[PDB]
A paper describes a structure:
The bacterium Clostridium thermocellum contains a single CE2 member, designated CtCE2, which is linked to the cellulase, CtCel5C, within the modular protein designated CtCel5C-CE2. In this enzyme the oxyanion hole, similar to CjCE2A, comprise the N of Ser-612 and Gly-658 and the Nδ2 of Asn-705 with formate again mimicking the tetrahedral transition state. The structure of both wild-type CtCE2 and the S612A mutant were determined in the presence of cellohexaose and clear electron density for five β-1,4-linked d-glucose molecules was observed in the cleft, consistent with the affinities revealed by ITC. In CtCE2, interaction of cellohexaose with the hydrophobic platform is augmented by several polar contacts. Notably, the O6 of Glc-4 makes a hydrogen bond with Oγ of Ser-612 (in one of its two conformations) in the wild-type esterase and Nɛ2 of His-791 in the S612A mutant, while O6 of Glc-2 interacts with Oɛ1 of Gln-780. As was revealed in the 3-D complex structure and discussed in more detail below, cellooligosaccharide binding, with a stoichiometry of 1, occurs across the esterase active centre with both the Ser and His of the dyad influencing ligand recognition. The importance of all three hydrophobic interactions in the binding of CtCE2 to cellulose was demonstrated by the observation that the mutants W746A, W790A, and Y665A displayed no, or extremely weak, affinity for cellohexaose or β-glucan.
CE2 enzymes are acetyl esterases (that are generally not appended to other catalytic modules), which are reported to be active on synthetic aryl-esters and acetylated xylan. Here we report the biochemical properties and crystal structure of several CE2 members, both single-module CE2 enzymes and CtCE2, a component of CtCel5C-CE2. The C-terminal domains possess an atypical α/β-hydrolase (SGNH-hydrolase) fold, consisting of repeating β-α-β motifs that form a curved central five-stranded parallel β-sheet, in the strand order β2, β1, β3, β4, and β5 with strand β2 interrupted by loop insertion.
Author numbering: 10 to 334
The structure:
Amino acid sequence: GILYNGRFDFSDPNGPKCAWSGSNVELNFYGTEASVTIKSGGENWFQAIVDGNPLPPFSVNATTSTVKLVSGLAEGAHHLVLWKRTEASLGEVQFLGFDFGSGKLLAAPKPLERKIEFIGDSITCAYGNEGTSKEQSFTPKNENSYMSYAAITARNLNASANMIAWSGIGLTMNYGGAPGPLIMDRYPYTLPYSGVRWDFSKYVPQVVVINLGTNDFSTSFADKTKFVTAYKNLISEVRRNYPDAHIFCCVGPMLWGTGLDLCRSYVTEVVNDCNRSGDLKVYFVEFPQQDGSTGYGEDWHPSIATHQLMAERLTAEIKNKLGWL
Ligand SMILES: OC[C@H]1O[C@@H](O[C@H]2[C@H](O)[C@@H](O)[C@H](O[C@H]3[C@H](O)[C@@H](O)[C@H](O[C@H]4[C@H](O)[C@@H](O)[C@H](O[C@H]5[C@H](O)[C@@H](O)[C@H](O)O[C@@H]5CO)O[C@@H]4CO)O[C@@H]3CO)O[C@@H]2CO)[C@H](O)[C@@H](O)[C@@H]1O
């Protein structure tokens, strides 16, 4: 009856729980209106997309609330997507039930056959993408993962996407060397704060996109051996979960100067080594450095325009390798 698109935990009979950016619930209903009850651990933001039209977003902040998603529609069958805009670090969310007024739930859409997993950091979270000032610091309201390069690429390809991304995370270090779990430590989890492990058999993508290393080179440059080994470890893990996946290793568009040259050198070394070792389904993609001609979001993170450029590039790369025309 309902599609739960993402890494969801179903252990609580009161309602499915999720954390990662871009987690979304998708359903068909008959009627004129729809409501949902949401519990949120922090300041999470959502958007309802109803018959293909995105509605003004709303937050549910460290509380449980019943929210009217849409109303006053022509009575009939409608398609609804409820999208978690904000990232896992802003808290787990539990969906406690829908209400359709005098209407009803209808058969759910067929799940998409094409599947992508994205693994990344602030760029894939779409940190700050609805801010237009690079001087402004992070606000949850301005983080719109629906307009991340990852979400846009998935819609371009008629694919579902799981967005396994955490702002500031790296392969060898987090932003500014702040201590914390690194990507390989969070990657195994459905709910990374509470230790609920993800069962990798539940979602086997044909494509994995990795965009990591910005935090490894934006302040103090990571050690080459350490970084290359860490990146290889991650690819090994992805390959062990998904023997048949095409893996796209991506650099850009936030790195600049020497940090960008070193990151490019190290990641292309990783890809070339995987290829020589016999894995021909590991590829490299570079998003050209943002130069200001497409503006900036909060803390210099990519604008929606820059996300759109990335999505055009990445869509064409995946179409090429997969034949996903
Ligand atoms: O609060 C939520 C979340 O925060 C995480 O930490 C955030 C941190 O709070 C931010 O301050 C930080 O922002 C920095 C970016 O990561 C970093 O990439 C960016 O670096 C700039 C650089 O400052 C700037 O000089 C550079 O300019 C270049 C131009 O882009 C080029 O065109 C030109 O040729 O060259 C110049 C430089 O010569 O641009 C780059 C980016 O392109 O600076 C930001 C700070 O100013 O981001 C962190 C990670 O998201 C924290 O980790 C979380 O735990 C926390 O929840």
